[PDB]
Symmetry: D2
Subunit: 365 residues, 4 copies
């Protein structure tokens, strides 16, 4: 049978350990996939530290992958109806939803499925066939996985990264009920989520894209990938930033704001930048935090504002994200600062934790 290896999380806050798995057969309808690129996410650090309550042990982490089909045990179609075969290059939606609940079937919001099963997050490696995350030479995909064939003209590293931060960013923009033509977009934060938001905002036809953050290196990147204006929170005052946005928008404020900071306190700045009638997509905050002092009359009622929380993404967002991403490979590849062998998965988590890396991608040896 097949000799696979992976980096396994056995106990929280303890280094991932190398382990080998002999793969004999795979479940009916499943797809055995050779991982070619595996994204390391900020959230993987959180999971490693034992702060994500969905996470069983032991587990093969890694929810962002691109790979080559080794074997389908039976037949599997991709989302366009193409039958997969050995050697096909694919990406896939990390989440499988039930297809039977209120959100999957009635409201058509499958990202809200309470039964959502996610590779490298709530799928452990204890029970055979074990290989349920991307920090591995190989992953076994269930037959219910949403898959998309890609080609050798696709940058698999970029696609892997895009699966997570990109598709969330896409969801955030997709909730806006108008075209972006003529619109001013403000993005708070310049990690992968905010930076995909720059390229997504550009690609959907936004007039002006402004990014507010605190790292000059990340802000330079934002400019190289399409931002019209960047504002460094450490070099400018709140009022200076408000005036720059008010100047650009003829005194109205921004039409659409993306929170991509991870910090609930971002809404305090963002609310004062939003025009009357504007739309604030809140997608960065990823853990419970202290409550923020929210001014209901000023920020919601008087402003006639929409505040929209964004929870992950579904298959519609996945395919649309691949499509935008595929027009933007050269720019988006600039987000990958580090490329490491799988056996260095621990160092990769350190790099991400310390912010030495913007994004790290692992490759099996």
């Amino acid at each position: 049978g097949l000799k696979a290896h992976a980096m396994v999380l056995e106990k929280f806050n303890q280094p991932l350990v190398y382990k080998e798995f002999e793969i004999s057969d795979i479940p009916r309808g499943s797809i055995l996939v050779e991982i070619l690129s595996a994204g390391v996410c900020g959230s993987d650090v959180h999971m490693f530290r034992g702060e994500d309550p969905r996470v069983p042990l032991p587990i093969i982490l890694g929810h962002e992958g691109a790979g080559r089909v080794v074997e389908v045990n039976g037949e599997k179609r991709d989302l366009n109806g193409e039958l997969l075969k050995p050697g096909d290059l694919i990406v896939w939606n990390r989440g499988i939803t039930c297809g039977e609940c209120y959100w999957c079937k009635v409201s058509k919001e499958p990202y809200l499925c309470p039964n959502r099963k996610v590779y490298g997050i709530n799928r452990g490696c204890s029970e055979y066939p074990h290989l349920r995350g991307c920090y591995s030479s190989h992953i076994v995909l269930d037959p219910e996985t949403d898959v998309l064939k890609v080609s050798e003209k696709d940058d698999l590293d970029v696609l892997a990264m895009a699966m997570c931060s990109g598709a969330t960013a896409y969801h955030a923009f997709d909730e806006y009920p108008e075209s972006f033509a003529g619109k001013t977009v403000v993005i708070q934060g310049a990690g992968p989520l905010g930076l995909f938001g720059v390229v997504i905002a550009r690609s959907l036809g936004a007039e002006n894209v402004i990014v507010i953050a605190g790292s000059p290196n990340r802000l330079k990147l934002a400019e190289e990938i399409g931002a019209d204006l960047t504002l460094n929170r450490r070099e400018t005052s709140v009022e200076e930033r408000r005036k720059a946005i008010m100047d650009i928008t003829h005194g109205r404020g921004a039409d659409f704001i993306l929170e991509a900071t991870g910090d609930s306190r971002a809404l305090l700045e963002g609310s004062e930048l939003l025009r009357r009638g504007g739309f604030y997509s809140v997608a960065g905050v990823a853990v419970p935090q202290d409550p923020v002092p929210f001014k209901v009359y000023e920020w919601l009622v008087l402003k006639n504002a929409t505040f929209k929380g964004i929870w992950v993404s579904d298959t519609s967002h996945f395919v649309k994200t691949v499509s935008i991403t595929s027009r933007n490979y050269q720019l988006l590849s600039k987000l990958i600062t580090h490329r490491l062998p799988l056996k260095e998965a621990n160092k990769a988590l350190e790099l991400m934790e310390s912010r030495e890396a913007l994004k790290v991608i692992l490759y099996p040896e």
Copy 2:
């Protein structure tokens, strides 16, 4: 023509009776005899000097129905009917500039920064003076959006509906799906929330639940269509959440209307809202202390929409009259007092004390 009005000359001092002689009216204007004038809870705040838009002196009253006396030129209503002396009409209290970003580009006229409103930011010092409904007569500018009504319409109900009803309608109109199969929770049982009951019912909501503190208002909400009322003073937060969870199979409410006037209503409402739900916030009407808002739990993880609602526009006005017109007998139950115009000071006192739910004034 000799008109009279009850005029606000000094905040916190009683409205005073005053006579006005109306000869010429401005070009294009419509002189209207007031038949019904609603006394709104916001008029109390204006009376008390709490509204910074309010010039003095001013004839208050932004909620009106009346009879056309004359048109200086020609005026069509929204359906294109030329107005003539004798016609009965209602009208939108607000006039927008029709030239700014919100009027012409984003098509959100309610957000017009140049919005002019009878009985609110239009004083009575300058001729022709009559720019509010606490008067025998009002002069409507040509730009006013008007609708003709008939003798089969209830003008008292229509006056009331103009304000609270049209804001309630705006709150429901922002919901991007139909209300079929949906559970609606309304927080509050003043005019705003009670209109919400009738609008929710009228748009097809499956369940309409009202949370408030007054048994008399809760009985009324039942009478006009609520499936369930929950008295906030006689139940726990946890009991009310359980009741809503039982009705929605453990999910929560699809749509919540905040109609209390208290920002703290979001603390409870946020925990009733299903994942993916929609919270329209329309009641809070003054700057208040900030509330501790749980961004992850209430917005992000919930994938929720919080939508603030500012007043209403002409599309909301027309839709509100249409709903109201199919519900006159239910909605007339909100009017607890009808007083002559000269007793306007008592009307304000009734509304302030909540001895009244809604007061209508009539001239003479």
Copy 3:
């Protein structure tokens, strides 16, 4: 157990009564005792071999309500409730693949090319055989979308609603605004149009006008909420257009539903539609000769939306059940005949001749 069903062996051959011995059912499947089975006009086309989807032999019947006999394993309804013996249920006739572009990307499961439908494209020759509602029992796959109902629900009405009702609902669901203040014109007064009357009313339409040729169906349309009916034998096309222009102040209808089954309906409907109006075309159910379409006048100059409507999905299912549940007394009037299952041929005959509006079959 020994079930019985009425089987279609050859097109145009009378349905044959047959017994089926059921020993065990596939894993996760649900064995359901049929309590009400609706006979649809589309069953007549199937019976004659006009529907190219139809395998033979087949147990027809795609409108069903029933009582759970057994689940081989466990099955949750759409609200997550575990089904158990004795539960009353309704279900979506169609099961979609959950994997294709329509199911997963555009979220239009009604357009699934792999859609499997009880009594339509599921034959009865392979065990467990019972894949249609003209039967004492049906075996539902684990993938079926089910909803529990109660003894307070009218199951005869629910069976009917599953088809025509959910298609009507889809047609209204596509309209991008509220129905408040709107005038709705419905063409045709069979079950689709009649459900259209009730739905239009329930979503808050101001005026509902029905145009058809059957006096008795038009009387029923008034009994269930139409404001005006217009009979094509008794009125001219010009008289109809004037009546609709009078109600809409010269503009035309805001929303039209085609529910006649005839392509030529568009000729009249296009001239009743306001500029900017919305025309949902849901009745035409077979390929027909092309109609002469005036692209400039009816689409471009009118800035009109013509929207075709193909069946329905689980979202429309639940929402239809929800509106129907509030209108059982009105909608019961559509059921003109109830016949034992063994009389299924006569039921198809009644539906073909239009002596019935809707027939319900009951086992035993």
Copy 4:
């Protein structure tokens, strides 16, 4: 003492436009006197010249596509962003003024459908002072109700003038689509200015694939140059070949979104067969009553669950968004301007547009 202006006046249908001079002193309260710098010649100007548009009074100064420079404002005028206009400002404006009082303007919020819509160079004659109500002129007088946008010396006024008509109608067509264009396949029928602006708008909104079907190789080459992924020449392929091409690109589904930009009702016969189940078809090119086409209701509407949406002109929201898209694509869109003529050659301009020797002509005073 007054301002000396001149224009090319249509006095009688099918007779040459005639040069005439005017002296402009007073203008109506609130009005803006504008020096024309660019005037687009539209294909519909030909039909109006010929006496085919029932809206057209005589005499009239044609030209509904314009950009220019503020000479004077009688009072005050703010552009749509709130900026006060002053003499010397460069502007563009919406050709159409709506009443702001009717059902469509106030209730349904569809001002393009206002029955009282007043359009420079179309239904506004030139015989009553101050006369200058069209762009085939040295100057135009804009009413206070006109929606205006200030532009800069870095904007291409020739491209903006053209964009005002064909471009805003194409924008309207795309704006009616209820989803994002991400991952979508767009087919455009026709490669005149309307269809060609469609290409740039489709690209700008993020469409994945943009395909153009037309009959002219030159125009199909232009469509490729401004961002089309594929062109199909309908004179050199069968309907079946074109459908196969679209089916191959869309994994056998059909187009997500089609724009009819041909002017021929018969285009729907092919487009309907290219549309996927659940697809959206904006019909914007057909501009005059035509014979009815044989429409297959079951196959093209019902079974397809298709949306067919007719597109009538545009409003100020479309205007502003068109100017924004256009402003990022000046160099591509300038490729559409094939001829620039002096105002006094307006008759030759119409000839060029009618013969189709020109794709788009711009007129310039002086």
